[PDB]
């Protein structure tokens, strides 16, 4: 089972297509679901082509055998969501990996900020260095950590907000977590940010 694409940007009024491939051939035993964040899934279409009562007519399912398409015509604001196919020819019942449809807007470069650990965090015995990428679009972004101008992997974690309801951007935190002894066996700390809105990777840094 293979659902594509993994993600998709569109505007209100567009027509979107999502596809599911099931190479073993599953006749018409496929359904489509919609899911919004923090909510239960909703069945849109079953038996490949049947629209569930109460689901808007702008949703249409097609296919038989190996390739299946969900077409969402004239996208409405309520349609920005994640979509999943489900195969039920055989057990185990299996879902596709999902397709997130988000809102298209113009490219916006992140504003990048770096936060040096407070004295009290250093007395903590564990220090967290935070790099903020603020209000960017599209979602795709890359963060690398550099200590003493040298690459560091393994001790960072990323967290991202949902698309902002006012300006349709994302924000992301990258947190580098080290022991106090380790925190400054080092001198200079930096994070380099790569994004489509930057003509070249931006680095913000500190030392002390």
């Amino acid at each position: 089972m293979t659902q594509s694409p993994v993600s998709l940007s569109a505007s209100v009024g567009d027509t979107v297509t999502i596809t599911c491939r099931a190479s073993q051939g599953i006749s018409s035993y496929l359904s489509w679901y919609q899911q919004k964040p923090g909510k239960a899934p909703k069945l849109l279409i079953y038996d490949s082509t049947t629209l569930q009562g109460g689901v808007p007519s702008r949703f249409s399912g097609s296919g038989s055998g190996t390739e299946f398409t969900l077409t969402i015509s004239s996208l409405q604001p309520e349609d920005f969501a994640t979509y999943y196919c489900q195969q039920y020819e055989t057990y185990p019942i299996t879902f596709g990996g999902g397709t997130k449809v988000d809102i298209k807007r113009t490219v916006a470069a992140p504003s990048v900020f770096i936060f040096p650990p407070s004295d009290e965090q250093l007395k903590s015995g564990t220090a967290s260095v935070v790099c903020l990428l603020n209000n960017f679009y599209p979602r795709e972004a890359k963060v690398q950590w550099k200590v003493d101008n040298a690459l560091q992997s393994g001790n960072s974690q990323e967290s991202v907000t949902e698309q902002d309801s006012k300006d349709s951007t994302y924000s992301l935190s990258s947190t580098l977590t080290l022991s106090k002894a380790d925190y400054e066996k080092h001198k200079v700390y930096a994070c380099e940010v790569t994004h489509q809105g930057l003509s070249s990777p931006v680095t913000k840094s500190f030392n002390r």
Binding site: Y29, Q86, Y88, E89, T90, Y91, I93
Partner: peptide, 8 residues
Amino acid sequence: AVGIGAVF
């Protein structure tokens, strides 16, 4: 079929 495909 299985799941909702076997309710009948």
